Amino acid sequence: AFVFSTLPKLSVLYLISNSNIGSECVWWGLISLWLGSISQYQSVFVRSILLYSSVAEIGLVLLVLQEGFSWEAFSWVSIYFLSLSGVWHANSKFVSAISVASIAGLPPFLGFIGKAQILKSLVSINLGILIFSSILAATISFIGYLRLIRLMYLVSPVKWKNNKDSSFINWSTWMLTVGTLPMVYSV
Amino acid sequence: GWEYAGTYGALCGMVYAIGSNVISGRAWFRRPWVHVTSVTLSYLGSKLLDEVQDTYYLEHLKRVERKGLQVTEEHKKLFS
Amino acid sequence: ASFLKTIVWRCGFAIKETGLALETLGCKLQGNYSFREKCSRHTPLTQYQFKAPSVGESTFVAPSALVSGDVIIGEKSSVLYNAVVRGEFKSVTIGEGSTISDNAYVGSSSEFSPETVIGSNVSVGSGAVLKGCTVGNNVLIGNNVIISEKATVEDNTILAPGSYVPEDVVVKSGELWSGSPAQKLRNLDEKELALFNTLSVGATELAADHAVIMKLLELKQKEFIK
Amino acid sequence: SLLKNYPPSYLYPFRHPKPEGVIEKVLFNLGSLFRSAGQGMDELGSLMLGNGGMQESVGPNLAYAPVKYNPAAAPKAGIVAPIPASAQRVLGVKEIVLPSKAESTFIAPNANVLGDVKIGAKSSIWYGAVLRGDVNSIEIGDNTNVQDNVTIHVAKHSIDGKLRNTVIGNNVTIGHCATIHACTIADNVIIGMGATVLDGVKVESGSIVGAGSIVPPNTVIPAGQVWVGNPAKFIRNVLPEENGFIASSANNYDLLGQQHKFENSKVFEEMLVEEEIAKDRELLEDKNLAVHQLYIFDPQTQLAARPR
Amino acid sequence: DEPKHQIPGNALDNWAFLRTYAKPLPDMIHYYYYVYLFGFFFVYKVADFPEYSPRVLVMAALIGSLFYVRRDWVHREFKDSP
Amino acid sequence: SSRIAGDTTGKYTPNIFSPETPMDRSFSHVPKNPFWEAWVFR
Amino acid sequence: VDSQAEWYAEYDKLEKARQKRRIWKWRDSDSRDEYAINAEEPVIYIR
Amino acid sequence: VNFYDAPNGPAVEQVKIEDEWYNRQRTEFNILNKQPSKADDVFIAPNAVVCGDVDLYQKVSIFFGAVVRGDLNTIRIGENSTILDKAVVHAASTSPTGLNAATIIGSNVTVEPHAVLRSCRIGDNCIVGARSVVCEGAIMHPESVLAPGSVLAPGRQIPSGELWAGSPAKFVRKLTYYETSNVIRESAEHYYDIATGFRNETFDHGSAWRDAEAYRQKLVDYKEYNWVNYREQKYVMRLQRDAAELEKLL
Amino acid sequence: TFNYVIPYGGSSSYTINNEPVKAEEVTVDFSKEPSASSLKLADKSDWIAYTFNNVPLMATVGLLAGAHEAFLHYERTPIYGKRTYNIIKKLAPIVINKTAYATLLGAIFCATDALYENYSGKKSYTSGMVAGAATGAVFAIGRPLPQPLVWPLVFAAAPVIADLFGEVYPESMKSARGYGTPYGFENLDDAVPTRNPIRRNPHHY
Amino acid sequence: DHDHYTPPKTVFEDTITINVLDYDGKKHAVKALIGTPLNKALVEYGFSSTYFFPNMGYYTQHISDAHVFIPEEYWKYVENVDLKTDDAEAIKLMFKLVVQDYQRETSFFASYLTLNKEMDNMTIGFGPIKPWHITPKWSFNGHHNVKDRMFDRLETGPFIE
Ligand SMILES: CCCCCCCCCCCCCCCCCC(=O)OC[C@H](COP(=O)([O-])OCC(O)COP(=O)([O-])OC[C@@H](COC(=O)CCCCCCCCCCCCCCCCC)OC(=O)CCCCCCCCCCCCCCCCC)OC(=O)CCCCCCCCCCCCCCCCC
Ligand SMILES: CCCCCCCCCCCCCCCCCC(=O)OC[C@H](COP(=O)([O-])OCC(O)COP(=O)([O-])OC[C@@H](COC(=O)CCCCCCCCCCCCCCCCC)OC(=O)CCCCCCCCCCCCCCCCC)OC(=O)CCCCCCCCCCCCCCCCC
Ligand SMILES: CCCCCCCCCCCCCCCCCC(=O)OC[C@H](COP(=O)([O-])OCC(O)COP(=O)([O-])OC[C@@H](COC(=O)CCCCCCCCCCCCCCCCC)OC(=O)CCCCCCCCCCCCCCCCC)OC(=O)CCCCCCCCCCCCCCCCC
Ligand SMILES: CCCCCCCCCCCCCCCCCC(=O)O[C@@H](COC(=O)CCCCCCCCCCCCCCC)COP(=O)(O)OCC[N+](C)(C)C
Ligand SMILES: CCCCCCCCCCCCCCCCCCCC(=O)O[C@H](COC(=O)CCCCCCCCCCCCCC)COP(=O)(O)OCCN
C-alpha cells in the first residue's frame, strides 16, 4: 500500500507537467480536498485515515500542478514518501509519531517544507476559494492526525509486533528531522 | 552556497547515531563505530547537497539570462 | 572529580566495545561463530563502572556468588554459594570473620537505603534478606530472617529463624528475638554467648576447604583451556 | 533429505570448513588480522577501565562438584574419586568425594550440588538449589523434586550423637525457596514454598507443610496433617483428594524434569543449528515464496523433504 | 463512585434503536461502479458546461451538501415496503 | 497510629510496610462531599 | 564592535537574498512539449 | 529422555552434567514448543533464568538469581515490573479456584527478594514484600501492598489500597493517597534505573567465549574435532523412529 | 520602527504620485478573458432570464442528490425475492422531490438576488445576504425553533463567502507579480525582465 | 467513628459459573468473578480468537468484544448508551459490519454486561458473526477452525498490520 500510493504518483505528475495536461476546472481538487478531509475525520479505522489523507493532499497537489508548479510537486512527492514510510512501516511508537507529524505538516519536520511548497504555490495563483478551503480542510485533517497521536500515547497501553526490519526507516526519520534546514531555500 | 553545511552535517550525523541508539533502547554511547560512520557520511552528503544546489542555481541563472532577464554583474555574483 | 571519572570510563568502554566488535568481525570473516555461544556470563566479583568489590586475601567467595559494586570484605570472611551481595547503589561493608550463607541476599539497592554495615563474627543464615541495616559484632542471624532498612542489631544477639525486623527497630544486646514482628523472648545464656567465636572459626575452616576445592576446579578448567 | 548440494556454510553454521578458495583463504587471513587487532584494542580499553578491567571467564561446573575427602569420616552418600596426578603434586589432596546421581536425575546447570549428596532416579534438582554435603551426607529418594532456590543443609552429629543428616523420602515435593536443615522427610510429603524446616524435625508420610511456615526444631509432624504458621501448628487433616494431588504433583514435576533435562543437555553446535532451524521456520512462514513451489520442507528441520 | 453524565433514554430502547443498523449489508462495489461510470461521463460533460457565477456555484455546493444523505442514514431507515 | 515521614537529617525512607499511617502530604487533604462533587460536575 | 558595519552587512545580506529569490522565482514552463516558450534553450531529444 | 516430536527436532547429541567442564546455563531458553518473548529494553541478569512461555513487556527487569519458569503455564509480566533477587515466578497447570492459572503480573509491580508468586493475578502498582508467598488462585488487586514475610492462601483476595501483613495475611491499614500514587510507581522507576545502568555496561557477546574457543581450536589442530550435519541426523533419527514404531507389535 | 518612542509603520504622501512603470518590456498573457457565455449568464438585467439561465445548476445538483438516495434504496432491495410493489413507483418520488426542492430554492435565491440588485441599482453584498436569507427562510418554514435563525444565517453567509473570495480577493491582489521588482518598490535594484514568465499555456479543456 | 471492618470474600465465594454455548454447539462452564465484564471472562476462559472482534470505536479498538445472546431476564444489567455520543457509533458500527442479518432481539455485546452474583448459572450463547475486516492481521475469513486462544494474543489491537 505504501509503495503503490507514492511511487506511481511521480510518473503521473511528470506526464501532466511535461505534456501540458491541465484543465481550467478546479472542482476536482476542491472536491478531493473536502471529501478527503471530512472522510478522514469520520473514519474509525486507522488505515482509512491514512488513505484519505493522500486523497486530500493529492487533490491539492493536482490543483497546484495544473497551474505549472512542477518543481513543487516533485519536491512534495519526495517528502511525502519519506513521511509516509515510518507511519506505514510501524514498529516504534516514536517513529510513527514523527511520521504522523510530518504528514500533518508540523514545522520542525521535513513534512512542513513539503506542505509549505504547495501552500506557497497556492498564494501565487491568488484563488481565494482554494485558500479558504485549504485552511479549513487542513484543520479537519489535523484533527484526524491528532486522533492518530492520541491512539498511540493517550488511549491505552500499546503493544506492537517486534518486526525489526527497519531498512530505511531510521534513515527516513533522520531525513525528516534533519532535512528541514538544508531544504529551507525552497521555501 | 551555505557556509555551515559541513558543521550541520557533522552534527546531524551525531543526531543519527544517538537517535538510532535511543530508538532501539540502547544508550547514546553504545555502538561507537556507528557514530564515526554516521558523522562522516552525513558531512559528505551535506557538502554534496550544497554543491548540487549551487550547480542548479547556476543552471537557472543561465536559463533566465537566455530567456531575457537582464541580470547585472552583481546579480551574476549572487549565484556563485 | 566524578565527571572526569565518568568521561574516562566512557572512553575506555567505547574502546573496549570497538575492540570486541572488531574481534567478532574477524571471527565472522574466518567463519568461526563461537562468539554466539550463550554460556553463563556470571562473574563472582562484578564491578559497576569504577566501583569494584574489595576482597581480602584469605576470603572465600563462591563462584556462584555475586558480589557487586563497592563491597569491602574483611579477612577470614566467606560469601557462600548463590549469595547476592549488591553494593552498586550504596556501599556494603562486611567485617572480619563474617559469613554469608547459601541463597542469602545482602544489599543496599533501595532508593533510600542506608549504607549496610556488617560487624565481625556475624553469620547470616541461608535465606536471610538484609536490606540497608547495621549488624553489630558477634550476631547470629536466623535462616529466613528479614531485616528492614535502618534497623540496628546490637552486639551479642541472636535472631531466631523466620523473624522479621521492621524498620527503625533496635535489637538490644544479649537477647533472642523471634516472630514476624520481632519481640524479645529471653536473655541469651552464657553458652550461646561463648558459641559465637566457635561458629565463626568453624565457618572459616569450612571456607578454607571450599577454597581448596575451588582451586582444584580452576586447575581442571585450565587443563582444558590451555 | 532430498538434496545433497546444500552449501557447506548452511550445513555447518557453527564453524565453516577449512577455506579452500583463494578468496576464502584471503578472508581467513584478514579475519586473523582483525581478531588480533581487536584483542589488542580490547586490552588497551581494559587498561583504562581500571581494576578488574571488566574481564570475563568461563565459570566452573558446580552441578557435580567435589568436596574435600575426610579420612576420619568416610563418605556415606557420594562416591570418592582420585584427582589428576598434577593437581596432586600441586594441591596435595589425595581424594575428593563426588556426588552420586542416577541416570534419570535432572540437575540444573545453575544448581550447586556439593559433596555427600545421593539423588535417586527420576529426581530433579532445579535452578538455584544449593545442596551442600560438605560435613554430612544428604540422601534424596526417587521422584523427589527440589525446586528453585532451595537450600538443603546438614551439620555434625556432635557429642550427643543426634543424627544431623538430611534424608528426603520418595515422591517428596520441596517448594520454591524452602530451606531444609538436618531433618528427615518421609515419603509423599509436600513442603510448601518458603517453608523452613529446622534441625531435628521429622515429617511423617502423607503430611503437608504450609507455605512460609517455620516448623520449630525437634518437632514431629504426624501423618496426614497440614501445619502452617510462623510457629507451625496443626490446622486440618489432609483430604483424600489431596493425596492424589500430592502424587500428581510429583509425577508432573518428573515430566517437567525430563523436559528440562532434554533442553539443557544439547551441545552448543546443536543449539546453534536449532536456532537456525527456528529462524528459517520464521522466514518460511510466508507460503508465496518461490522456494515453496520447488519443494515441501520438513517441519521439525526445515530441509527439503519432497518436490512440490 | 463518581458523578457521571445522565444518558437520555431507557437502556433497552436505546439498544433496540442501535439494533436497527444490523441489517443485510450490500457490497460497496455496486455503488462504486455506478459512481465511477457516471463520474467519468460527468467529467466529460463538465468541460462543456457554461461558466457560472461564483455565488451560484457556492449556493449549489451548499444545496448539495444539505441534500446529501449519508449512507448509514438510508441503511438504518430502509424498509422493503411500497 | 501516625508517624513522621519527613526527616530533616536526610535519612528519609518510606516505610511502606509500617502498621502506623505515615504523616505524609496526604494527611492534610480535605474530605470531599458526595453532593459538592456532583455540584462541581453539574 | 562596529555596530554600523554589522547593521549594514546584515541588511546587505538580506537584500542579496531577496534579489536572489526574485531571480529564482522567474520560471518559465519546462515542458518538453512546450517548444515555443523555450525556443532558445539548447536541448536534444532522443525519441 | 529424547523428545522426538520436539518443534526443532530430536537431540542428536546430549551431554551429561558430569562431563561439563564449564557453566553453560542460558538466561533465556525455549522449553519444547514454548518460547519466551522479550522487549528490547528488558534486562535479564546473567544469573537469572527465564524459560518457557514467558512474555516480558517493555522495561521489565529480571535481577540476579530470579527464576521465572513458564513450563506449566503462561507468565506475563507487565510494563516496568521488576523481579528482584532470588524471586521465583512460576505457574501451576490448574488453579484450585477454577479460573485461569496464568501468572499475570501488572505494571509497576515490585517483587521483593525471595518472594514466590505462583498462578496469581497481581494488579498494577503493587508491591510484594520479601519472603512473601502468594499461593495458587490468589488475586492481589491494584494499588495494594503485601508486607514482608506474609502468605496469601490459595483463592484469597487483597482489596485495593490496603496493606496486608502476617502469615495468614490480614488487613493492617488503608494506604494513603500519596503512597499509592507516588511511592509504588517510584520504586519501579528506581529499579528500572538500576537495570538500565546494568544494561549500559553489558557487551553484546562478552569475552567469555574465548575460553571455549581455545579448546575447540586445540581439538581442530589435533584433528579430533568432527563436523556433524545435525539437520540430517535429526531427519534420519525421526525416520528411524517412525519405522521402528510402525514395526512394533506391542 | 522596532522602538518604543515613535509610531510603527510609515506614512506615504497623498500629493506625490509615482508614474506607473511597466513590469516588463513585453507582456504576454496566458489568462483568457471571460467568455460571452459567462457574461450572458451573469447578466441580471431581466430577473426571469437570469433565473432560467442559472437554475440548470441547482437542478443538476438536485438530480445528483436524488439519484444518490434512489440508488441507496434500490441497492438494498433484494433481486432474489419477488416484490409486490413497483420499485420505480417507490423511487421516482425521491428523485423528483429532491430535484424540485433544489430547483425551487435556487430559483428563490436567483430571483431575489436579481430583484434586489435591480431595485437597489448597485452590485452589493446586501443583495446576496437578502437572497440567502430568503432562501433560508423558505428552507425553515416548518422546522423547530433553532433552524429559523440558523438557516437564514448560513444561507446569507454563503454569498458573502463567494463574493469575498471569488470577486474581491482576485481584483484586490491583481497587481502583485512575484518576479522582477516588488509592485510598489521599483526604485530597488532587482533584475528586470524583458518578458513576463509564462508558466503555462492558456487552458483549453 | 471507626466502624467494623468487612473482611474480603475468598475467590471461591465470589466465583460464578456461566454456561456458554459456543459456535460448534458445545456447552462450556465458564467460571467468572463478580464485577468483571463478560468480554474479559470469556477471553480468559480460552475461546479462540475468531470468537471475538475489536470494539469498533474511535478509541476502543483495544477491547475485544463478542456477539452474545442474553436471556430476557438479564437485560436489566446491560449498560445504557447515549445515542448522541460515540459509544453509540461504536455499537452501530459493530452491528452494521459484524452482526448484520444474524441479529436477534436478544443480541448484545459482552463489554456492556458486567457479571454479578445474580448472573450465577446464566446460560449465554455466542451469536453468529459475519466476515469482517479492519486490517489484514485483524480480520475474520468466516472459518472457525483455528485452535488458538484470544488470551495468547499479546498485541492490544488494530493499527497497521
Ligand atoms: C556529481 C555532480 C552532481 C551535481 C549536479 C548533478 C548533475 C550531473 C549528474 C552527475 C551524477 C551525480 C548524481 C546527482 C544528481 C543525479 C542527476 C543525474 O544523474 O542525471 C542528471 C544529468 C543531466 O540532467 P540534469 O542535470 O538534471 O539537467 C537536465 C535538465 O536541466 C532537466 O532536468 P531538471 O529536472 O534538473 O531541470 C531543472 C529543474 C530544477 O531541478 C532541481 O533544481 C533539482 C534539485 C536537486 C535536488 C537533488 C535531490 C534529488 C534526489 C535524487 C538524488 C540523486 C540520486 C542519484 C541517482 C543517480 C546516481 C548516479 O527545474 C524544474 O523545475 C524541474 C523539477 C525538478 C525536480 C524538483 C527538484 C526537487 C527534487 C526533490 C527534492 C525534495 C527534497 C527531498 C529530500 C531532501 C532532503 C535534503 O544526467 C547525466 O548527467 C547522465 C546520467 C547518468 C547517471 C547514471 C549513468 C552512470 C552509470 C551508467 C551505467 C550504470 C550501471 C552501472 C552502475 C554503476 C555503479 C554500480
Ligand atoms: C545532514 C544534512 C542532510 C543532507 C544530506 C544528508 C546525507 C544523506 C546520507 C547520509 C547518511 C548518514 C546516515 C547513515 C549512516 C550510515 C549508517 C551507519 O552509520 O553505519 C551502519 C552500520 C551499523 O552497524 P551495527 O549497528 O553494529 O549493525 C550491523 C551489524 O553488526 C551487522 O553485522 P554485519 O554482518 O553486517 O557486519 C558487516 C559490517 C558491520 O560490522 C560492524 O559494524 C561491527 C563493528 C565493526 C568493527 C569496529 C569498527 C572499527 C573501528 C571503528 C572506529 C570507532 C571509533 C570509536 C572508538 C575508538 C576506538 C579506538 O562490517 C563493517 O564494518 C564493514 C565496514 C568495514 C570496516 C570494518 C572495520 C575495519 C577496520 C578498521 C578500519 C580502520 C581503522 C582505523 C582506526 C580504528 C579505530 C579508531 O555501521 C557500520 O557498518 C560501520 C561501518 C564502518 C565501521 C567503522 C569504520 C570507520 C573507520 C575507522 C575510523 C577511522 C576514521 C574514519 C575516517 C576514515 C575511514 C577509514
Ligand atoms: C446512480 C449512482 C448514485 C450516485 C449519484 C451520482 C453518481 C456520481 C456522478 C458524478 C459524481 C461526481 C460529483 C458528485 C460529487 C462528488 C463527490 C464524489 O463523487 O465522491 C464519491 C462519493 C463516494 O465516495 P466515498 O469516498 O466512498 O465516500 C466518502 C464519504 O465518507 C461517504 O461516507 P458518508 O456518506 O457516510 O459521509 C458523508 C460525509 C462526507 O463528507 C462530504 O460529503 C464532503 C463534501 C463537502 C463539500 C465537497 C466539496 C464542495 C465543492 C464543490 C465544487 C463545486 C462548487 C464550486 C465552489 C464551491 C466551494 C465549496 O458528509 C456528511 O457527513 C454529510 C454532510 C454533507 C456534506 C457535509 C458539509 C455540510 C456543510 C453544510 C453546512 C450547513 C450546516 C450548518 C448547520 C450545522 C449545525 C452545527 O460518491 C458520491 O457521494 C456521489 C453522490 C452524488 C451526490 C452529491 C450531491 C451534490 C453533488 C455536488 C455538490 C458538491 C458537494 C458534495 C456534497 C456531497 C458529495 C459526496
Ligand atoms: C543528498 C542526499 C539527500 C537526498 C536523499 C536522497 C538521496 C539518498 C542519499 C542516501 C541514501 C541512503 C539510503 C539509506 C538506506 C538504509 C540502508 C538499508 O536500507 O540497509 C538495509 C538493506 O537491506 C537489504 O535488503 C539489502 C539488499 C541490498 C543491499 C544494498 C544494495 C546496494 C546496491 C548498490 C547501491 C549503490 C548505488 C549504485 C550507484 C549509485 C538493511 O536493513 P535490514 O537488514 O533489512 O533491517 C534493519 C534491521 N535493524 C535496523 C532494525 C537492525
Ligand atoms: C469569515 C467571514 C464570514 C463572516 C462571519 C460573520 C459571522 C457569521 C454569521 C452569519 C451572518 C452572515 C454573514 C454576515 C457577515 C457580513 C458582515 C455584515 C456587515 C454588513 O452588513 O455590511 C455589508 C458589507 O459587509 C460584508 O459583507 C463584508 C464583511 C466581511 C465579513 C466579515 C469579515 C471578517 C469576519 C471574520 C470574523 C471571525 C472569523 C470566524 C468566522 C454591506 O455592504 P454593502 O456593500 O452591501 O453596503 C450596502 C450598500 N447597499
DSSP A93-132: HHHHHHHHHHHHT-TTSHHHHHHHHHHHHHHHHT-HHHHH
For the CA of A171, the nearest atom of ligand 4: 14
Q: How long is chain F? A: 42
Structural contact between residues J84 and J92, judged by C-beta atoms closer than 8 angstroms: no
Spatial distance between the Cα atoms of C48 and C13, rounded to a whole number of angstroms:
12
Distances (CA, A) of H204 to C16, C36, C41, H45: 12, 9, 11, 13
Structural contact between residues I115 and I47, judged by C-beta atoms closer than 8 angstroms: yes
Give helix I47-76 / helix I87-120 axis angle, nearest 10°. Answer: 160
Spatial distance between the Cα atoms of I34 and E21, rounded to a whole number of angstroms:
51
- Residue whose CA is at the smallest distance from ligand 2 atom 47: C22
Give helix H230-247 / helix D268-283 axis angle, nearest 10°. Answer: 90
Query: Cell triple for residue I10?
Result: 510609515
Nearest to F17 among H129, H178, H184 (CB): H129
Spatial distance between the Cα atoms of D25 and C29, rounded to a whole number of angstroms:
10
Q: How was this structure determined?
A: cryo-EM
Spatial distance between the Cα atoms of C195 and C140, rounded to a whole number of angstroms:
10
Place of cell 534486562: H43
Spatial distance between the Cα atoms of A84 and A96, rounded to a whole number of angstroms:
9
Spatial distance between the Cα atoms of H169 and D216, rounded to a whole number of angstroms:
21
Nearest to H179 among F16, F20, F29 (CB): F16
State the distance from the centre of ligand 3 to the C-alpha of E48, rounded, in angstroms: 22
**Contacts of H231 by beta carbon, 8 Å cutoff, 6+ apart:** D1, D11, D273, D277, D301, D303, H9
- Alpha helices by DSSP H, listed for chain J, are 38-45, 87-94
Query: Cell triple for residue J152?
Result: 495468547
- Residue whose CA is at the smallest distance from ligand 3 atom 35: E70
**Left if phi > 0, otherwise alpha if psi is -120 to 50, otherwise beta: which for C125?**
beta
Place of cell 480468559: J44
**Left if phi > 0, otherwise alpha if psi is -120 to 50, otherwise beta: which for C194?**
alpha
Q: Is D225 helix (H, G, I), strand (E, B) or coil?
A: strand
Distance from CA of B57 to the nearest CA of I (A): 15
H32 burial level (CB within 10 Å; 0-12, 13-18, 19+): middle
Spatial distance between the Cα atoms of D25 and D17, rounded to a whole number of angstroms:
11
Structural contact between residues D287 and D308, judged by C-beta atoms closer than 8 angstroms: no
Contact A22 I170 (CB under 8 A): no
Structural contact between residues D249 and D230, judged by C-beta atoms closer than 8 angstroms: no
DSSP structure class, residue C32: B
Contact A20 G31 (CB under 8 A): yes
Structural contact between residues D125 and D146, judged by C-beta atoms closer than 8 angstroms: yes
Place of cell 493532499: A57
Structural contact between residues A125 and A68, judged by C-beta atoms closer than 8 angstroms: no
The interface residues of chain C toward chain D in range 145-204, judged by CB-CB distance below 8 A, are: 161-162, 179-180
Residue H185: CB atoms within 10 Å: 16
Spatial distance between the Cα atoms of C115 and C104, rounded to a whole number of angstroms:
18
Chain A positions touching I173 (Cβ under 8 A) are 126
Contact C34 H208 (CB under 8 A): no
Contacts made by residues F28-36, CB under 8 angstroms, sequence distance 24+: F29/H177, F34/E1
Tell whether D227 lies on the interface with H, counting CB pairs under 8 A: no
Spatial distance between the Cα atoms of C90 and C112, rounded to a whole number of angstroms:
10
Chain H positions touching B29 (Cβ under 8 A) are 200
Structural contact between residues D104 and D42, judged by C-beta atoms closer than 8 angstroms: no
Structural contact between residues C40 and H24, judged by C-beta atoms closer than 8 angstroms: yes
Query: Cell triple for residue B28?
Result: 547514546
Q: Is C142 helix (H, G, I), strand (E, B) or coil?
A: coil
Distances (CA, A) of C74 to C88, C92, C197, C211: 18, 11, 16, 16
Spatial distance between the Cα atoms of F29 and F33, rounded to a whole number of angstroms:
13
- Alpha helices by DSSP H, listed for chain I, are 36-42, 47-76, 87-120, 125-139, 146-163, 169-172
Query: Cell triple for residue A57?
Result: 493532499
Place of cell 501516625: F2
- Domain C2-225, CATH class in plain words: mainly beta
Element housing G14 (H / E): helix G3-25
- Alpha helices by DSSP H, listed for chain A, are 7-18, 27-42, 46-66, 70-88, 93-104, 110-125, 128-153, 169-178
Query: Cell triple for residue A35?
Result: 471529501
Place of cell 561458629: C199
Q: In this structure, what are the phi and psi dihedrals at residue H82, rounded to the nearest 5 degrees?
A: -115, 125
Structural contact between residues H7 and H33, judged by C-beta atoms closer than 8 angstroms: yes
Place of cell 584478514: D30
Query: Cell triple for residue H160?
Result: 485495593
Beta-sheet strand order (sheet of D95-98): D67-68, D95-98, D79-82
Which CATH number does the domain housing residue D74 bear?
A: 2.160.10.10
Spatial distance between the Cα atoms of D188 and C34, rounded to a whole number of angstroms:
46
Query: Cell triple for residue A132?
Result: 479558504
Q: Is D299 helix (H, G, I), strand (E, B) or coil?
A: coil
Note the resolution in Å, 1 decimal.
3.0
Distances (CA, A) of A153 to A46, A92, A149, J56: 15, 12, 6, 19
Which of these, I22, A69, G24, I30, lies nearest to B69 by C-alpha position? G24
Chain H positions touching A157 (Cβ under 8 A) are 79, 107
For the CA of B37, the nearest atom of ligand 2: 19
Q: In this structure, what are the phi and psi dihedrals at residue F36, rounded to the nearest 5 degrees?
A: -65, -40
- Alpha helices by DSSP H, listed for J3-145, are 38-45, 87-94
Give me the DSSP letters along chain H: ---TT-TT---S-B--GGG--S----SEE-BTTB--EE-TT-EE-SS-EEEEEEEE-TT-EE-TT-EEEEEEEEEEE-TT-EE-TT-EEE--SS-SSSS---EEE-TT-EE-TT-EEES-EE-SS-EE-TT-EE-TT-EEPSS-EE-TT-EE-TT-EE-TTEEEETTBTEEEEEPPHHIIIIIHHHHHHHHHHHHHHHHHT--SS-TTHHHHHHHHHHHHHTT------HHHHHHHHHHHHHHHHHH---
Give helix C190-225 / helix H209-221 axis angle, nearest 10°. Answer: 40
Q: Which residues line ligand 4 (CB under 6 A)?
A: A 164-168, 171; B 45, 48-49
Tell whether B4 lies on the interface with H, counting CB pairs under 8 A: no
Asked if residue E72 has its Cβ within 6 Å of ligand 3, the reply is yes
**Contacts of H126 by beta carbon, 8 Å cutoff, 6+ apart:** H106, H108, H109, H110, H140, H142, H143, H144, H145, H146, H184
Spatial distance between the Cα atoms of C118 and C105, rounded to a whole number of angstroms:
13
Q: Which of I38, I50, I68, I110 to mutate to test the interface with E (most CBs of E within 10 A)?
A: I68
Distances (CA, A) of A119 to A116, A138, C168, G28, I168: 5, 11, 69, 20, 20
Chains interfacing with B (3 or more CB pairs < 8 Å): A, C, G, H, I
Residue A150: CB atoms within 10 Å: 12
State the distance from the centre of ligand 3 to the C-alpha of E80, rounded, in angstroms: 26
What residues are paired with D65 via a beta bridge? D114
Query: Cell triple for residue H235?
Result: 531427519
Contact call for G and I: 3+ CB–CB distances under 8 Å: yes
Spatial distance between the Cα atoms of I118 and C162, rounded to a whole number of angstroms:
104
Spatial distance between the Cα atoms of I78 and I75, rounded to a whole number of angstroms:
8
- Alpha helices by DSSP H, listed for chain D, are 8-11, 22-49, 85-91, 240-265, 268-283, 290-294
Q: In this structure, what are the phi and psi dihedrals at residue G19, rounded to the nearest 5 degrees?
A: -65, -45
Full residue range of the structural domain in which residue D256 is found = 64-262
Chain E positions touching I76 (Cβ under 8 A) are 23-24, 26, 74-75, 78, 80
Give residue limits of the domains in chain C. Answer: 2-225
D239 burial level (CB within 10 Å; 0-12, 13-18, 19+): exposed
State the distance from the centre of ligand 2 to the C-alpha of B38, rounded, in angstroms: 8
Pocket test for ligand 5, best of I116, I127, I160 (most atoms within 8 A of CB): I160
Nearest C-alpha in C relative to H22: C221
Chain G positions touching I201 (Cβ under 8 A) are 29, 34, 37
Give helix I125-139 / helix I87-120 axis angle, nearest 10°. Answer: 150
Spatial distance between the Cα atoms of D95 and D81, rounded to a whole number of angstroms:
6
Which of these, A130, H191, H162, H133, lies nearest to J8 by C-alpha position? H162
Structural contact between residues D193 and D210, judged by C-beta atoms closer than 8 angstroms: no
- Residue whose CA is at the smallest distance from ligand 2 atom 22: B34
**To 10 degrees, the CA torsion angle through C12, C17, C21, C23?**
50
Which of these, A72, A82, A77, A120, lies nearest to A102 by C-alpha position? A82
CA gyration radius, chain I: 26
Structural contact between residues I151 and E39, judged by C-beta atoms closer than 8 angstroms: no
Which of these, D124, C41, D269, lies nearest to H23 by C-alpha position? C41
Asked if residue A78 has its Cβ within 6 Å of ligand 1, the reply is yes
A122 burial level (CB within 10 Å; 0-12, 13-18, 19+): buried
Structural contact between residues I191 and G19, judged by C-beta atoms closer than 8 angstroms: yes
Structural contact between residues J53 and J69, judged by C-beta atoms closer than 8 angstroms: no
Distance from CA of H146 to the nearest CA of A (A): 26
Structural contact between residues C107 and C115, judged by C-beta atoms closer than 8 angstroms: no
Q: In this structure, what are the phi and psi dihedrals at residue H204, rounded to the nearest 5 degrees?
A: -60, -45
The three-point CA angle D43-D45-D47 to 5° equals 75
Place of cell 570497538: C18
Structural contact between residues J89 and J57, judged by C-beta atoms closer than 8 angstroms: yes
